[PDB]
């Protein structure tokens, strides 16, 4: 059991906050509580650009060809420009699905934020998807607009999708066809002021496609209200301060990079770092050393591959700027935890959630001891349990299905065009079952199986 | 008489503060007041880089070839690197004179900050100086180190200066001679951590050379304590908020671009903008529109050339971001005031000071009415008057010599290696005379002649 380290954490004590927390208190930190105008994108970007965080660096893009950095004001301007481009050329209205199919780049974030600002539902696609996956995801969602690069423009079958009107191409000298629009040319002539579509807490703003047990991808829809939890988990689990440099290594194509690489940091007003190109221990360690990254959010595969690079490889670089390390996507091996404590002299914080959950649910905390191999405890305001097939709670140390009490803000609203699968996730008694096996200890800690 | 505009200014009421202000209150905003370790460079840069302003953009640089942005952390790191370079290669110790002879560039600011951090006295030279002026200024100061560029390396007579040991060259493929060190290679191998030389309030940190009435340049020495006034005038006259973009167009070679282009903004933790290349209305208006500059500090000549450009030239660009405009270096023709109020719809704030005064003394304020053509009123904590040749105050509307009561923090400590000229600036009764004629009105406003 790795002991906790004393410090000035956002969550001072877990127990009292868990016993007393109410989501109405979390709703106080947002602008719409005082004004009534609600939008996740506005809360993530434009709220800070109109505050003392206006000139704070929001985004750090490092790539071999280009090295750029943007402030909150510049991010807001680029997002407004992208939203105007989409509204004018793609004819995107509230509720439309805008799919973004490009490698990780500042334009990706600008376009995603602009799409969400104007009321569209943004769906990111992995750059490595072939023709089949792109076809299925564009057909199921009936996506109106796709934004891509010349390299991946050949992987989209425009002729096989009657519901796809416009294709935006960023970069390169792409010839604008009947349904192809060169994004940069349109953007250069657009304004930086956007009339933001004010939304309702039950309207969707993200659409993420997951590989289902039946073999067909399903669209998970998240609503704006999820930002509430996205903010709170950004403060408790990430422990984001004002002086933190935050780096999330997950791709924006997946849910992890979209939630905790875009929204969780920027809702807290943090500084986010994205790095282009493929993985290499040289590039990652050099990025950490040069940018002085304080908060790191990565995946167990990347950490294990880091382990494969050797201890001296890390010892060649200065990693003293790091202060908080977190992992997600796979239940972490405690040997990786020992290696991290041996290299960075830090505890790697394992967190658990799924695409349907919207945000992390069961996590390790800076103020809590970390038991190696354990997922941790549910966040305050969220109730979790180990239940049988009849919805009855099981005593500790008994194997069972990991269930969460229905009703947390970051819950998925539905499964796109498949209500039966949506209702298939819930058990009698208000228990959302995740299909995963876990067991609770006598101390309240959860262990995955 | 241009009326004042209501707003949330730092100086809410001029009269009450002027009647009650004491410099001991101003001393409370600095770290040294509690810690006891005093340095102007630390207060300007490293204090903010260790606060909630760590990731705030400190410097924008823009020219025809480069476009870079630096945060307070990055500025601190570059300054520490430059200080280490100077300490190791130039053998610069406390009290030495380090002269900087280069065009405006991030390297200039890094080198000047690093020199001041290690206790040296920084002296900037105008890029347009020929061999004669550089020779006189390097001989009078007995400067140990000169830092320059390959273009201006030919304008320095190394052989004629026995007191010049090292010459640093930044950029270009300069062959390192017996006394020539190429700055970039030395910097690349140096650390970003600097053991800062903690100083005393009466030690000099700036040396500025002015054209004297006798024809020979004289070295005006300013002490660290001046930062106090440099901070206060940065808050009252500049009206710097947290969300202000500050642009000073004066060259760092002169006193104006050093006090109010380096120290006054960064002591307040503001964002400074520097633009390379020659003046052109296209470049200046585009810089204002693109960066959204809020606070502007320029010179009447630069405003007059923008007059010559025409109103239709400015009407093309977006200048709504500007909220405060100030002028210095020459009495301001009030026709320029009407033109500014016509174009930017703003009041141009004229300020008066000299190289010997260290910071502005008599200014217009955001909370005060601006009488066109008047220099304004003395800052709180500074007493000014119109005196005759015998040191007696004159009644309003009578011509006389403009004198300031001796003892303000930003006073020059001495004239370098010439005490007689230093004592020649003061009259009996504690009145420092500036050699300029001005008259007071019945309302306390000063008018230059």
Residue numbers in the entry:
A (entry chain B), B (entry chain A): 5 to 453
Authors' own words:
Acetyl-CoA synthetase (Acs) generates acetyl-coenzyme A (Ac-CoA) but its excessive activity can deplete ATP and lead to a growth arrest. To prevent this, Acs is regulated through Ac-CoA-dependent feedback inhibition executed by Ac-CoA-dependent acetyltransferases such as AcuA in Bacillus subtilis. AcuA acetylates the catalytic lysine of AcsA turning the synthetase inactive. Acs enzymes consists of two consecutively operating modules, a C-terminal domain (CTD) catalyzing the first and a N-terminal domain (NTD) for the second reaction step.
Initial three-dimensional (3D) classification (T = 4) of 1,194,314 selected particles using AlphaFold-predicted AcsA dimer as starting model yielded two distinct states. After multiple rounds of processing, those two states were turned out to be AcsA homodimer and AcsA-AcuA complex, determined at 2.89 Å and 2.93 Å resolution, respectively. MP analysis of AcsA alone (i.e., 37.5 nM) resulted in detection of a monomer (71 kDa) and a dimer (140 kDa).
